[PDB]
Amino acid sequence: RYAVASYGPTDALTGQPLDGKRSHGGLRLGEMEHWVLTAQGAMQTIIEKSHDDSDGCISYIC
Amino acid sequence: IANSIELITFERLILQWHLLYETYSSTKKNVMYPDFASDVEWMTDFLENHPLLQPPEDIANWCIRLELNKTTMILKSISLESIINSLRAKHPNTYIMHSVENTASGIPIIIRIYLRESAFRRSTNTRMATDEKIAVNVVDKLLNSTIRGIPGIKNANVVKLMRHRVDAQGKLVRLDNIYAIKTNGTNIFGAMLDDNIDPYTIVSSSIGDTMELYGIEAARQKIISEIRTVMGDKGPNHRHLL
Amino acid sequence: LRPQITYGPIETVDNEELTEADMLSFISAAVNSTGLIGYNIKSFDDLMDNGIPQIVKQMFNVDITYKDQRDHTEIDKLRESVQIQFNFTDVNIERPQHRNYSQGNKINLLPNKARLCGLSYSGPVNLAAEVILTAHYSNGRQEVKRASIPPFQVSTFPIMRGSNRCHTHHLSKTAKKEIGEDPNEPGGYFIARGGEWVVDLLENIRFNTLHIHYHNEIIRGEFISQPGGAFENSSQIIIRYMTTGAITIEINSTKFSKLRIPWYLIFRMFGMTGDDSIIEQVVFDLESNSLVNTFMIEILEKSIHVLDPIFQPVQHELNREKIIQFLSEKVSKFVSNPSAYKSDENAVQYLNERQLTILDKILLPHMGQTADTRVRKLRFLGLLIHKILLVIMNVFPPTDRDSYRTKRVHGSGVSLAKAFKAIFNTSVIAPIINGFKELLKQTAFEELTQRNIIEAFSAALSKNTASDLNRSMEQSIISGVSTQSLERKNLLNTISALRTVNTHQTERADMMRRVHASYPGYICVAQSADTGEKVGMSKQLAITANVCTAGEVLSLKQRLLSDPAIQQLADVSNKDIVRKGLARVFINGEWIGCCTNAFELAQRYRMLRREGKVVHPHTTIYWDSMVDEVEFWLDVGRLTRPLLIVDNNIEKYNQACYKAAEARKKGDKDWEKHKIPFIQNTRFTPQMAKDILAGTLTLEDLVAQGICEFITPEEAENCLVAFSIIELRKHKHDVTRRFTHVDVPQAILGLAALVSPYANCTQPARVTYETNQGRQTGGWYCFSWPYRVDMNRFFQFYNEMPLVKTIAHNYVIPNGLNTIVAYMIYGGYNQEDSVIVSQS
Amino acid sequence: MKICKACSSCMVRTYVDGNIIFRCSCGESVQGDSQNLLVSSKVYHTGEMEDKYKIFIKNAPFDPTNCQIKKDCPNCHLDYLTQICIGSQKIIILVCRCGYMSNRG
Amino acid sequence: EEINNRLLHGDIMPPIGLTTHDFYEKLQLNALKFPDRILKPIMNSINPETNGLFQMVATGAKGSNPNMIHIMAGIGQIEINTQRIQPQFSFGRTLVYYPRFALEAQAYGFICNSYIAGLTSPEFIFGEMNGRFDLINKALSTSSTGYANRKAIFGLQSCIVDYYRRVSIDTRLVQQLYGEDGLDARQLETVRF
Amino acid sequence: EPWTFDYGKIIKTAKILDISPAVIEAIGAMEGRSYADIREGQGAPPPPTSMDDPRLMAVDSAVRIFLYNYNCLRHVSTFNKPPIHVERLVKHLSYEEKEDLEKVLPNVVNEYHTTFKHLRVTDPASALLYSIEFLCISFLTLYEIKEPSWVVNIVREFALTELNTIIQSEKLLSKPGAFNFMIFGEDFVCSGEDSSMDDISAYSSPGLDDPFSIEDVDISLDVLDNLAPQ
Ligand SMILES: [Zn+2]
Question: How many CB atoms lie within 10 A of CB B49?
């Protein structure tokens, strides 16, 4: 069993949570999970999990 | 009709073939291979039984000796004349002799094809090929000659299937007494050229064969049908195949 | 030689009271004889006592020459190169030791201290050597200096726990129990960095055999040749038939490098330059009218006239010296300047001798390694090409990659020997050679004393390389030589891990995961992974199966060559073999002679094996009735199991048939009375079953009395086995089914598959599940758990013997409880693999 | 093939004016008379012919792993025979230790 | 056995398109199938009103008819890729327990016993051959499906319904109307015309 | 016909070449021996007893080297590019004389190959002597030829060059003496018995999508029990 937090250790390169319970990081919503959430039309859930909870940031383009 | 539609090449009726560097010997004084010198005994019978099948002037120094598998000729019910006539129709630049289609075990049936000079005039686009390489290629094309059936199909079975039809009273009735031919291998054009097959209702399982001959809209219906077959009975809705 | 012993008549053996539960005593005796993992300890002890000393004293002779770069004096200008030559004379391995940090003598290192402190259970290796240094001068004079080096410790070698060099070998069970060791475990693992590692049994193809496989190559025939012994260096040749019509022989070894040679050049290099005899080595007769010969000759003729762009200059050369010289240029890595030496008549002689010495020892070394076997090797090479062309003709099928008739299982002794060879060269041979190079660079050759030679040898092996041998052996043991960490889930897991057989295309990936028809009796048909990529990849030894050790090949070879029934190879012509129909005889793959009757020879030596005095009981005798070949195998790595021999009265039965015929032809009306009934039976009796349980009868006594014998998967193809004693009794008078052996049914399962009760009443795929679940079951995972610091280990307090137990519980501790179970619907909480437990 | 009479090499075959000439790399040239009029050959069903199983059929009565049948041997009057089944046509051959062979072999 | 007697007398003649080996295997596979009347002894032994094994199968809760037959009556012929057990043990032998060119059906995977009666050693080996395929194909049903799933999704994921109910790839029509009816697959009912 | 071994042919041939007769007797046996020992006849191995003795192949190899190169001289016109060992010999000749040398030169392969096969199988001791005597007889025939005059000095030089080349090539298979080991030019030279520079990968050795890999399946490794068949 594992449940972590809204916060914890992150990867210095990607900014995403560390992998698994051993690193005290997060769990993976993988490629197939995004296929299911897209098939359902649940885009605000994708923003919540893939952006707000994983590594979402602000980019500035001229 | 299903047994009529079954690709029997000349190669699969052969036990062994020998490529001999020999010309035609109307007499018993010319030189032959020692192991096959006794073949001249049934040659004389072949001359005395075929007055109009005389050996021409342009016969080369190249002979292909063939040994027929008598079991395959029996299991497939293939006559000797069916082989000989098929070979003479497709290969006009050769001279063919054969022994008798004897019924006694231990006496083999021998097919001997003498090449003609015209066979060595054809291969000009590849000028670095000697007569030996040309004669070997002729042997390869002789073996691949179709004796029976349409090319591309191995086996042709007979299946029972059910179809609907409207009666004269307007009723739609499912008819169960209909026999089809489910083949092994696809040649839509070959099946189309047969006069025993309905050409408007040829159902190939090949998408590429359907695309080439029928078009993209028929190939679209073919992709739908072939995914359905793989899916089975718990298959998805039709709109996902679409 | 005629067999001597005559047994009592099979008509008088009383076995009708044998129950299938009595037949479990035979399995008990087999397991007691072989132990459960005894082959591991035996293999490691063979490596320690015989393998490593042989490898060091015979396979590591160093003889190199380096350019002298010292040019400061007149003698320095005259001196051109120095020859460094040495070999090791004494090799010893001791028991693991530890310093104790008292600045005192070494003390014994017990395995538990190594486990706790993260140390290595490694024993010291002591080596002695003789060094010869020769310096050469421009005029042609040479100076030789010899030194003898006292024994010194080079590094430490990992010690298998429970083996001869383990400290828990001179202790009793009580003393083992009191030093923190599991008194009931057998051992068989290595302690490295505080972890426990199992060097697993590895599947390898059988050496000295031709493995023909279809693939610009049409067909391929591989052949790995080993000159005799588990620790020898092997040399593989690949005979490729290419689409261009060519046949190329490629020799891969420690010296050549993936270079494909036209096949007829190998024959020419040995003095066989006539084409009519080179073809004769493959077809065995140029004057044959067979249609197989016509196919052979037509292919061989085409292959001769194919242009190889690499070997073109010597393709038409009928002078063997020029062919040897040409190839010596290709395979000598130090010849980077062609024609600079051809003006020297002594450098050309050096290259030719260097090439011939390499070729004699590297091409088919199992047929010989001297000059006198060159023609003998060419006769054998033409046999291999002949066999490969028979598959091309589609006369014969290619090799079955899955069958165990041509497979070997190699343990820690063999695997650690191969790792040792590649590490001893890297971290012992290289530092010594380099150290001698610096000694010669900074000092004149003629100034050197014997003390300087001894010091340079010992100083060059500093702590940089002393750790290298032990650390590289540790890395080989840990990295996986396919190894695996010892997981102590329970006692069943530990034993099942030590009996595991491991291996090194989509159609090939499915086929290797299936259970093969050669498995029954040797590989458990049920034990595999039930999920994932490892389904069917790891294999388990069946309960009575063992791994054979190498036998006395020399003793049997001298007897076969002293046998009047066998004509020696140097006395028969290739014509004599085919026109007289002789049968080739092999021993460990080496073709040694021919016999007129292959069946008679195999049956005569099988009877000599039943006495066991003339032919060793662990000798494989195979008769290939498809090609009339007799094969003797005595090499390490064969799977064997004991099988009870079935005897019959077919000789008396045949005579009675003849007497009935002789009476019938003479008008006699009572000819039927002369026929006796057929009888087949085993000599195993209920009293033998009782004597096994009383401890007064062992498997060795059963073997020595001719009641059972050991059978290998390649010899199993000459056997017709009754699957049980009930099937043998059903056919006791069946002359149309004459069994050679009778099986005990439980022998087809491994130890973890025998835990399942009434397993033949369960769907077999579920028995595979239990082999996994029984190894993941909580229990007493170790009896020495309080002395250990392990990770993720569960010690279940209470364990029970099953009320319905199996034979597997005689050898492993049961893990579980006899829970009362109700098979009912109770509220819906037990659906879909759910279960309701009593809280009490 | 043709073997040179001096260097015992495999001579190369060429065709000129209805004659087969063998030319060796040593300059020797010869004419074939009758036994060299075989350019190429191929035999079919090699895995099922009679010459493929000759040794196997000879050894069949002595191999104890072969199927036995309850039939009298007509030659030695033994009361069992060895039954073997070869090929894709499943040809059945009964053989005996004395030398008897159904199919008259 | 009657087919084997015809084989031994040379009375087996294949039709056009089959070798004698293939026709013999077709005859043996068809002859070794359980009849429908195998359930008469099974249903004579059981009480449908009380037997829990029968009620789980008959109602559709769990199990099938071949499961009950295998447990209670007999397993029958082991078929792998629609074939019997191929001779894989040295040229004409299926196992070390049967002779070469054996004619009996037991030598080629015909299991005569049920699971209640228990299987002999050769029957357990043939059963393990069939059951190993199930484990191999279950492992392949994950990896091989993933390869086809990922390629199908990347080729199709750009197909999106637009405001005309069409399916397009960013502008380019893939369908003039989704499913040619414009409907959701979750909103359909089977209705007879 | 009863064949016997004549030792005078070897003495005569060695006298012409101005070499010790023990060098002729030791064709095929010079491997592993110093040339001085071979010249003096010391350490000569005993006569062969096995029909698989490599000496029989070695001497038969030398015989066909002579016969192959002799027939190249006989058929020099046939070659489009005659070999280097013949072009210098017949360079000073016209085409008529170069297409000659067939009807004037003797054929010296009379019954060798048949007789060698018979003796190799029957008595390998006699086969070794037959092939050495045949080689010396072949040299003498091409030496003592006297007619016509225009061919005497052109076939006699070839008999010297070829027989010496055969003996020289066999001499090259003997034990070398002293030479600079760096003439090859790579700073080192390893012997045939050295193990220091052996291929390391030749010890730990016997001598496209993975169908079972979950590569396109994005599943956690801690959850892989969800794939259990049950
Ligand atoms: Zn008989």
Answer: 10
CA distance C387 to C389: 5
Burial readout C549-558 (b: 16 or more C-beta within 10 A, e: otherwise): bbbebeebbe
By the 10 Å C-beta count (0-12 exposed, 13-18 middle, 19+ buried), F19 is classed as middle
> Which residue spans within C414-495 are E strands per DSSP?
483-485
Answer whether E19 sits within 8 Å of D83, measured CB to CB.
Answer: no
The Cα of E118 is separated from the nearest Cα of chain B by a number of Å equal to 35
Backbone dihedral angles phi then psi of residue C248, each to the nearest 5 degrees: -120, 135
3-state secondary structure of D99: coil
* Contact (Cβ atoms closer than 8 angstroms) between residue E34 and residue E76: yes
Give F145: exposed, middle or buried? Use CB within 10 Å, 0-12, 13-18, 19+: middle
Cis amide prior to F148 (ω within 30 degrees)? yes
Question: What is the rounded distance in angstroms from the CA atom of residue E150 to the CA atom of residue C762?
Answer: 38
How is the beta sheet containing B94-98 ordered, strand by strand? B94-98, B110-116, B59-68, B14-20, D40-43
Give dist(CA F168, CA C285) in Å, integer: 34
DSSP codes, chain B: -TTTS--EESGGGEEEEEEE-----SSTTS---STTGGGHHHHHHHHHH-TT----S-EEEEEEEEEE-HHHHHHTT--HHHHHHHHHHH-TTEEEEE-----STT---EEEEEEETTHHHH--S-TT--HHHHHHHHHHHHHT-EEES-TT---B--EEEEEEEE-TTS-EEEEEEEEE--BSS--HHHHHT-TTS-GGG---S-HHHHHHHT-HHHHHHHHHHHHHHHH-SS---HHHH-
User: C657: phi > 0 → left, psi -120 to 50 → alpha, else beta; which?
Assistant: alpha
Q: Name the token pair of B148.
A: 């029976």
What does each C-alpha distance from C514 to E80, E114, E143, F214 come to in angstroms?
A: 12, 24, 18, 20
Please list the alpha-helical segments (H only) found in C198-279: 263-269, 275-278
Report how far residue F199's alpha carbon sits from residue D40's, in angstroms, rounded to the nearest whole number.
44
Residues with CB under 5 A from ligand 1 (ion): D 73, 75-76, 78, 96, 98, 100
Instruction: Count the Cβ atoms, other than its own, within 10 Å of residue D41.
Output: 15
C711 vs C643: CA distance, rounded Å: 7
Give dist(CA C214, CA C391) in Å, integer.
9
Phi and psi (nearest 5°) for C135?
Answer: -110, 135
Strand blocks (E) in F8-76:
none
Rounded Cα distance, C219 and C243, in Å = 9
Alpha carbon of D8: minimum distance to chain B alpha carbons (Å): 24
C-beta neighbour count of C144 within 10 angstroms: 10
The residues near F33 (Cβ < 8 Å, ≥ 6 apart) are F26, F43, F174, F175
> Half-sphere exposure of C610 toward its Cβ, with a 13 Å CA cutoff?
21
Q: What is the DSSP letter of F228?
A: -
DSSP states of E4-49: HHHHHTT-----TT--HHHHHHHHHHHHTSPPGGGHHHHHHH--TT
Distance from the CA of D62 to the center of ligand 1, in angstroms? 12
Interface of E with A (CB under 8 A): 150, 153, 157
Q: Which of the 8 DSSP states describes residue E106?
A: G
Q: Could you tell me the two tokens for C502? A: 């491991």
Give phi and psi for C837, each to the nearest 5: -105, 150
**Contact yes or no, A with F (3+ CB pairs under 8 Å):** yes
| Nearest residue on chain F to A2, alpha-carbon basis | F222
Method by which the coordinates were obtained: cryo-EM
Q: How far is the CA of D72 from the centre of ligand 1 (A)?
A: 8
Given a contact cutoff of 8 angstroms between Cβ atoms, the answer to whether E84 and E31 are in contact is no
Report CA-CA distances (Å) from C89 to C128, C129, C148, C605, C825. Answer: 5, 5, 10, 40, 77
